[PDB]
Ligand binder design. Sequence first.
Ligand SMILES: C[C@H]1CNCCCN1S(=O)(=O)c1cccc2cnccc12
Lengths: 353, 19
Amino acid sequence: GHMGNAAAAKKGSEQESVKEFLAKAKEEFLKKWESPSQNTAQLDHFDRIKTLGTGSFGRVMLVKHKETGNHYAMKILDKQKVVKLKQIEHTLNEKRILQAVNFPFLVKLEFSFKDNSNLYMVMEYVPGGEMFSHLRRIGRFSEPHARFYAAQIVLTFEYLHSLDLIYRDLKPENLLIDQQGYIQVTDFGFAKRVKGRTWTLCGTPEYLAPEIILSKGYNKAVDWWALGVLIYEMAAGYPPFFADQPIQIYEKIVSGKVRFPSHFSSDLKDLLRNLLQVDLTKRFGNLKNGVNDIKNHKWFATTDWIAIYQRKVEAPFIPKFKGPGDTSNFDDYEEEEIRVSINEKCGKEFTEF
Amino acid sequence: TTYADFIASGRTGRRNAIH
Ligand SMILES: C[C@H]1CNCCCN1S(=O)(=O)c1cccc2cnccc12
């Protein structure tokens, strides 16, 4: 067989230990999911420094906690805009998830609170910037560099999926690089507890699985498809399916055809053909052997999964870091005042926040 | 090249979700 006695025993034991870890992590998650936290700070506890990123949700700002001096990333959501954009459930769910999960590559929620106008999620500041920026600047990542990041996503999805959480918005834009060069996943607005199937059309066109495009009931296998897209984009510098307009991207995604750069290793192409598999009955991560089909693939043969989890692997790339509160790895955004209001807005809708 | 085709797509910047 492919493994002799010592290697087979070691691999079997490792896989059983993962089961044991995940069972404990599920217990801990469900305890926090049922007995959460709330209203753990207020706005005038922080100095607002600079906008790190924006969206239709609102903005994320670097802030400095006055009493302690620690820097954080504060997501500010305007309640009225959240309601107008029909994102009430997503916003409440994001906070509930962030409050309950615990994993080394999932951003930590340090505080949350609300006022008459806004909702506030105060997360760890992740100073290395978006993977997206580094990828576009460097062009592409080497296969070892891509593999280092990919391994962290595999472990993170193994964790989330054990909790019955589907992530649904993997892309380099949503992956931050911390001071040690490791990944932080931050955005959980589209994540959903799904033990079986779900049906919402959501995600980013280049990263959508065919079964989402085709309006099917779908499951956690869409995250493994998106992993394939991410690995491809990290290693090529561009995603596998692109076009001027989303409908053309969707035609390519559902076609069953993907092309690879000549510099892709055969191991990489084989992994990607098995992740970017249109047929659900054949896609890695969705078979009887689950995540082990991915973790045991030849392209990951050099990956020490425990050492990645323990953050003991030397990262291929360390972002520039001039000190606490250094924002140089983020873009510049027009700064806008955060107006509260003497009148409570949307109190009923956000009672649970 | 495929890279040139990517540039031509105009989708080289940060990509929004469907919503
Ligand atoms: C995840 C990206 C996605 N692009 C849209 C804006 C949100 N951001 S962000 O501003 O860089 C960001 C979000 C959450 C937590 C953070 C912690 N540290 C630094 C930046 C953070």
